[PDB]
Design a protein around this ligand. Sequence first.
Ligand SMILES: Nc1cccc(CN2C(=O)N(Cc3cccc(N)c3)[C@H](Cc3ccccc3)[C@H](O)[C@@H](O)[C@H]2Cc2ccccc2)c1
Lengths: 99, 99
Amino acid sequence: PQVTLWQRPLVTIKIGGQLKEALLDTGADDTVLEEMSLPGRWKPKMIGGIGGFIKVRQYDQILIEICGHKAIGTVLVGPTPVNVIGRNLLTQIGCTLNF
Amino acid sequence: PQVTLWQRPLVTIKIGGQLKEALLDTGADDTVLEEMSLPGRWKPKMIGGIGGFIKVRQYDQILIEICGHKAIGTVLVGPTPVNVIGRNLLTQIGCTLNF
Ligand SMILES: Nc1cccc(CN2C(=O)N(Cc3cccc(N)c3)[C@H](Cc3ccccc3)[C@H](O)[C@@H](O)[C@H]2Cc2ccccc2)c1
């Protein structure tokens, strides 16, 4: 779809059986979700943002549906305020920025 | 133009007679730039990011040229580690997201 930026570019995602909403975020290199149960192994990671750093745990090879689109990648689950889909996944759903 | 998201979407801006690069950021509601000299007065505010919150200075009615397009808006200046152009200016230059 084409999305204009008058409102937050929010989308529905399905991850691990659960349905969420998440912000499409061109400025994020990574995807990070608030705490949710994911199965599997994970490794700790830390990421920086405005504000400072958070400790996060990294899951790889996670399937996500974003709108209908499926993709698989790394998701970081952590204490973010908002669930962010970052460039790692945006490339897979073919997302483009246009002006 | 069209920007894909395989690399970070940076653009040149001209702000306060100075030339900078910044990140086109659909997830950000506000424009936040690193410390620099803008003329004029400003109010303090704080903003939340990941990792927490920072205090910034709000300037209103500032001219910025983003990739050659001019815009006027609120810019926040403060301790970000990267310059971020958020939805308040992205909207003025007609930026769309699409997939
Ligand atoms: N790797 C990574 C993954 C996910 C998020 C971030 C860190 N980010 C933020 O903290 N933001 C707060 C931010 C940035 C600018 C303005 C505002 N209002 C908020 C928002 C996302 C956001 C988080 C929490 C609440 C709302 C939005 C912005 O939209 C994101 O692109 C980046 C901006 C950024 C900051 C530092 C370094 C690189 C990129 C980093």
